[model samples]
Target: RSVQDEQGTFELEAIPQRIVVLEFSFVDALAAVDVSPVGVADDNDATRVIPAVRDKIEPWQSVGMRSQPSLEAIAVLKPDLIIADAERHRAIYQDLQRIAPTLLLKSRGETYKENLESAQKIGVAIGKQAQMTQRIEQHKQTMAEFKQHFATQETIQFGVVSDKGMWLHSPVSYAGGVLSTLGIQSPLAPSEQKAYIPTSFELLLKTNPDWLLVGLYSQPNIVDEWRKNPLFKLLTAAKKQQLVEVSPELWSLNRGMLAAEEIARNLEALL
Candidate 1:
């Protein structure tokens, strides 16, 4: 099989049996197509994996963190193919290729469409194009169902709240892509063409969206502290009781069809 990624073209002799995935998005894509990876870089925490990933495959060897997967550990698995993140794993591309036919895919900072395209390329590389196509079409259909409920809802703004600060998700982020697909509006003006935009409580108040959705991650929930501010209470979303807490893994971490569907489902539930 021959496949092209951000790096270049790769030709594989046969369907990869023992696979290794270095990032969450590729792992989600493989699981969506009912393919199990022999090894995964799970950030050293099995619990960090989303429900869709945990339920699909059996226990696999941990390759370490996404930034620096343990090359020694991956070599022990003797994988036939390896799926790595373009941004995080590019430095070690040659090393990974030495172990197997490494395919670098864009996951981090990629739009939902790009992620799905990468998944399709991965499916072709592994000879599961038919299964991937079927799964993606099904995901789109589910997204369409969720889009109906969003028509009556007001504009929403989503962000990730961490100890460092709150980072607003522009309409180009993964969650933003899902929101845009559902015909949802974001009050954050498109000042820059980026995924995340760092903003302050004052700035958030300035935007004053009709709905606010926050994802609390590993660090303490900064939104909780921001709520104590009188200025935060003045936001339209707060006044209207439209502030919502969302799952970080589905919205911010995982960027595949499975996570996208779960996000759409959660949006439906919230609305």
Candidate 2:
């Protein structure tokens, strides 16, 4: 099999059997097409792998954190392929390739379209290009069914809230782009071309989306204090109690064909 990635082109004389995935999106890509990796950098917390994507894979060794997986553990697995994130794992690309043929692709910093394209590359790397292509078309079909509910063109915004601050997902973000495919969008204007924008309560009101979906990273997060502020009432979504809490793992962390499909289903449930 021959395929291209962020690093460069790769040639595999035979299909790689023992694979390792270093990011959540890579896990989604592998699991979506019925491939089970030998090792996964699960951040040591199994829950970080979303429930649906998790059950698909039987069992795997945790290589450690996605940011810095244990190279020793990866070598012990003797993997033939190692799917890594370009943005996060670029530094260890050579080391990973030394252990196995590494498919270095964008995940953390990729948009929705890029994610699918990456998934296609992953499928090719795993020698399942046809299955991956069929999966994407099926995903679009499923999303189209969910798109019917949002014909009203309701605008929605997603944000990750932590004790330190809040970062809103722009229209170009994974969350926003996934929802947009289902005919829902975020009215929040992009200050720059950033996917996740550092946002404030003032900007929240400024966008005033029809729906304000938040994924809480902490209980006493910044949004907790923002809720008590007088400006909170000025927000359109707040006034109508349109604020919804979502899973950061799914919305912010997870990405790919299956993840996008699940996101569309979850968004439709809100309707």
Candidate 3:
């Protein structure tokens, strides 16, 4: 059986007995549904691949297909579904589909939510719908409780900025989605209006949010290290001692069901 994917492009769908997720997010989502894949993408965001998604996977059973996968390697596993992206891996899509029913996702970049939606679609394809739904609700309830318990005198205007050296997350991004669920209005402008421009440090200084939700790519404890930077001293968040670093695993790395929940709890603790 085969049909068009979420992008309305043709794709194949075989009974996914041994699946492989080309993107880490899909791998995480599939794991959330308790269906371990035969293979998964290597984690680009962290050294430990799929730390959040590790429970459902075995260290030895998976292949790392960060970019162009070893075709012979995939052929050995004989996956029923080969999830990939048309934009990044278009050159090898035809070759990969020959190995299995290739379902190409849109693009995984700053657009994590859409990509996760792609994972959810993958879940439905693999008969994991019920599991995904249940997991979603569980996470939602958990996240809600964290926010409810946190009673601050004032709601903080906060945002997560990354040192990824390019466009960082805005109020409209997935992290924004998490904060909004806590009833926090993004002080930043909508990406649609501004065309998703990355905010300047000067602009950030001027806004001077009550709290700064920082995401760093260095060691796990680098968030602590950042507190010593002179730039940190100038920031109102540091001055107020309101700077909090969200875990790279949950904040940047996770594409699983519990990601938002994890982020919410962490944010609650920080507040």
Candidate 4:
């Protein structure tokens, strides 16, 4: 059988059994179809896998970091098919193809529409097209139902705060896609090639959105630290106590249908 991925078409002898996924989105997609990968590039840390997805996945070996999957570990698995991120694995595509029929799919920095397209292509390759379609449709249905509650919600700004710094998630990011589905708007806009745009507390004060959704990951609590400043109180969102702490994993990582639903659910609970 032949499958068309982001990199064009390739033929395979049969349905892939021993599959290896190199990114979180692919892992999420496989789990959505009730298919478990033989291995995953989990940055050698189990926590890197989202808790909700980790629970559903079967026991699988780690293939190292998403940036640099261990070719040796993957070869040992003797996978029949290997699904890789287009951006991360392009340099090593030839090497991966030597080990297994590699399908290059978009992952990091891909729009929600692109991610869903890649997921469907992966399903076709793995003979789970029907399952993937059902999962995607179900997610859309869930989003439609959840959207009714916030039909008249105010515009909000979403971003992730870490030790490095804070970056606003533009309308191009996964969280932004969820926000669009909920009929919410993000004040910060991204460049054509960018998703997360870096920002400062001072800059945020200027935007002064009605609601601020922050994904808190590291300690020192940067958002909390910002609150101590008198200027922080000047922001309308902070003054109205509309600053919400959300999960970085949901907001930044795990860009899949199930994860999107969980994000919407979080919004419903919060709003």
Please report the candidate that would top TM-score against the real structure.
2
Which TM-score value belongs to model 3? 0.76
Backbone-clash count (model 1) = 0
**Ranking of all predicted structures according to lDDT, beginning with the best and ending with the worst:** 2, 1, 4, 3
lDDT for model 2, on a 0 to 1 scale? 0.85
lDDT of 4 by residue, 1-271 (tens): 5667767897776989999999888888899888899999988877766788878879799989889999999999999999999988999999999999999998788777778888888888888878888888887888888778776547688888877778877777777777888777666654435677787878787778788888887876667778788888788787889888877777777788878878877877877
- Candidate 2 vs candidate 4: the TM-score winner is 2
Using TM-score as the measure, name the better of candidate 1 and candidate 3. 1
**Per-residue lDDT value at 256 in model 3:** 51
Q: Per-residue CA lDDT of candidate 2, range 1-271, in tens?
A: 7877886787788888999999888888889888998899998998988889888887899999999999999999999999999899889999998999898898785688888888889899888999988988888788888887666677888899999888988877777788778888569664447888888777777778888899999997998898889868887778888889999998989876777777877887787
* Candidate ranking (TM-score, best to worst): 2, 1, 4, 3
lDDT of each: 0.84, 0.85, 0.61, 0.82
- Compared with the true structure, model 1 gives a TM-score of 0.94
Alpha-carbon runs more than 4 Å astray in model 2: 190-192
Report the C-alpha lDDT of model 1 over 1-271, residue by residue, as the tens digit.
6778988897887889999999888888889888899999988987767887879987889999988999999999999999999989889999999999899999888788888888889888899889988888988888888787676557888888887888888888777787888888878676547888888877888888898888887455677788888777788888889888887777888887878777777777877
Off by over 4 Å in 4: 190-193, 221-225
In the range 5-54, model 3's lDDT, one tens digit per residue, is 74465544445888876766667677777777787666333344435567
